[PDB]
Amino acid sequence: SEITYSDGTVIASIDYLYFTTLAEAQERMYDYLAQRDNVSAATQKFYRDLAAKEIENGGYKITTTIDQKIHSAMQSAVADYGYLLDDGTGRVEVGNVLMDNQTGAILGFVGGRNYQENQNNHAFDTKRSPASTTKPLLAYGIAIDQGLMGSETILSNYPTNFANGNPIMYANSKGTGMMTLGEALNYSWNIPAYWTYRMLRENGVDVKGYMEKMGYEIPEYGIESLPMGGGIEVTVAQHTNGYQTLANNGVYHQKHVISKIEAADGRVVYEYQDKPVQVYSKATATIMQGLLREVLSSRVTTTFKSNLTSLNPTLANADWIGKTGTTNQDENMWLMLSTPRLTLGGWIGHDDNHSLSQQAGYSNNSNYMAHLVNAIQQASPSIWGNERFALDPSVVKSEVLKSTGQKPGKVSVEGKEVEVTGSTVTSYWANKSGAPATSYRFAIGGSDADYQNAWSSIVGS
């Protein structure tokens, strides 16, 4: 029995690479064994063991998805550049996963700083809160998909409180005012994501149907801070797969590190079976792509594009989209990146869950990732692609007011039917009729005080 890289080259017979591959193969077998000895449905355990025997003893050739030149380049990038991560807080660990957007196949990964010194696989084993990288999946993507907001929809960021009366905070700030979806995402403000998930619940939206299609296990959906990543912990590999679904215009493919297991007699025993699912519509996923493009361009929450410009100005011109997250004590940082072909997930942190430095996600993980991305391209010059993410033909563009995010028109501004007028903007929608006409409660969220204040500077013009 052996494991090969995608090209057929021998990995080994029966060091993260070996362990991660054998584990998956054994899981393959086990699922099957629950029907070879005919068989059916805490033992278990017998079958887990049975599987590891049947694998080590058989004369099986297991073919991985692992691209060999890419995977070793990624090993060399972490050896060469992991020191970029160090910030005077102890050993900063790292996990990464590179995934094919069309297939769900994993091409390479970083399991940690150095397997010799520390064996924890940070790509496939360790689970951490995804923090604000939860928002495009769980809040905004689904609200767009249910036809409840469009690209230029306005949301509340005015101060507001949880049900216990504690304030919703963003670092030391308590909120500001009305803002577009662009601005909410670029800065990653929390209160507008609070109100979006809260509106999804008021409408009875099946949020869990969406998350379980991308393979997400969340034990409790009834949690106010859920869209900021509370009550959620994920592996890097499972997280890259929610970003694969958005990059790939809304169609999930399941991650996998094995395509083919073959007998000693060359018969095809096991084959990866593709089960594509349209999680979000095409309108939705292509709208969210255009938003996440701006997250990386505006450079508010990450320096990644500047880093990549200076290392490889030609790769910096590829069509990068992405999103960041910080857990609320600086303990874990995330940076998720896609071109149309690939998606690289990244996590940093400490095994013992304690703070990182203040600019560890902003600057440190961003600069490391940008060295990682360039290393990947140096070893496979056309893998990232030159393609562009592009709005779907089904997208509905509406012409809306900047100030409201809805169509211009008449509104009763505290009784006194006003004529609402001013500069307009195109707004992309994933429904049938686009954006409504302006009503008085024009944002997602807000208290009457907020709208008194809102409306009386809109009126003032």
Only one of the segments 165-173, 254-262, 304-312, 352-360 lies at the binding site for Cl ion (rule: CB under 5 A); that segment is 304-312
Only one of the segments 130-138, 295-303, 409-417, 434-442 lies at the binding site for Cl ion (rule: CB under 5 A); that segment is 295-303
CB 210 within 8 A of CB 279: yes
Count how many Cα atoms sit within 13 Å of the Cα of residue 78 in the half-sphere of its side chain. 22
CB 196 within 8 A of CB 155: yes
Only one of the segments 11-19, 243-251, 300-308, 400-408 lies at the binding site for Cl ion (rule: CB under 5 A); that segment is 300-308
Using rule CB under 5 A, residue 402 touches Cl ion: no
Which of residues 259 and 306 has its CB atom nearest to Cl ion in the complex?
306
- φ and ψ at residue 199, rounded to 5 degrees: -60, -30
CB of 318 to Cl ion, least distance (A): 17
CB of 299 to Cl ion, least distance (A): 4
Which of residues 69 and 299 has its CB atom nearest to Cl ion in the complex?
299
Q: What is the dihedral of CA 67, 73, 79, 81, to 10 degrees?
A: -120
CB of 298 to Cl ion, least distance (A): 10
Number of residues that bind Cl ion (CB under 5 A): 3
Give how far Cα 327 sits from Cα of 8, 162, 198, Å.
Answer: 41, 18, 21
CB of 183 to Cl ion, least distance (A): 18
Rounded CA-CA distance 176/181 in Å is 14
Rounded CA-CA distance 245/169 in Å is 30
Only one of the segments 213-221, 252-260, 291-299, 377-385 lies at the binding site for Cl ion (rule: CB under 5 A); that segment is 291-299
CB of 305 to Cl ion, least distance (A): 7
The b-or-e profile of 231-256 (16+ CB within 10 A means b, else e) is bbebbbbbbbbbbbbbbbbbbbbbbb
Q: Tokens 């990624």 identify what position?
A: 74
Element (H, E) at 62: strand 61-64
Only one of the segments 305-313, 316-324, 370-378, 452-460 lies at the binding site for Cl ion (rule: CB under 5 A); that segment is 305-313
Which of residues 34 and 300 has its CB atom nearest to Cl ion in the complex?
300
Among 174, 282, 299, 350, the residue binding Cl ion under the rule CB under 5 A is 299
Only one of the segments 105-113, 293-301, 355-363, 395-403 lies at the binding site for Cl ion (rule: CB under 5 A); that segment is 293-301
Helix (H, G, I), strand (E, B) or coil at 30: helix
Rounded CA-CA distance 326/338 in Å is 19
Contacts of 20 (CB under 8 A, 6+ apart): 109, 111, 121, 123, 124, 257
CB of 365 to Cl ion, least distance (A): 14
Among 306, 355, 359, 378, the residue binding Cl ion under the rule CB under 5 A is 306
Which of residues 151 and 302 has its CB atom nearest to Cl ion in the complex?
302
CB of 448 to Cl ion, least distance (A): 40
DSSP string, 269-300: EEE-----EESS-HHHHHHHHHHHHHHHHS-S
Which of residues 121 and 307 has its CB atom nearest to Cl ion in the complex?
307
Only one of the segments 105-113, 212-220, 263-271, 302-310 lies at the binding site for Cl ion (rule: CB under 5 A); that segment is 302-310
Would you say the C-alpha torsion 62, 63, 64, 67 has a positive or negative sign?
positive
Which of residues 21 and 188 has its CB atom nearest to Cl ion in the complex?
188
Give how far Cα 128 sits from Cα of 19, 187, 349, 365, Å.
Answer: 21, 22, 9, 16
Which residues in 319-378 contact Cl ion (CB under 5 A)? none
User: Which residue minimizes CB distance to Cl ion?
Assistant: 306
Which of residues 64 and 326 has its CB atom nearest to Cl ion in the complex?
326
Among 303, 326, 403, 404, the residue binding Cl ion under the rule CB under 5 A is 303
CB of 168 to Cl ion, least distance (A): 28
Q: Which residues bind Cl ion (CB under 5 A)?
A: 299, 303, 306
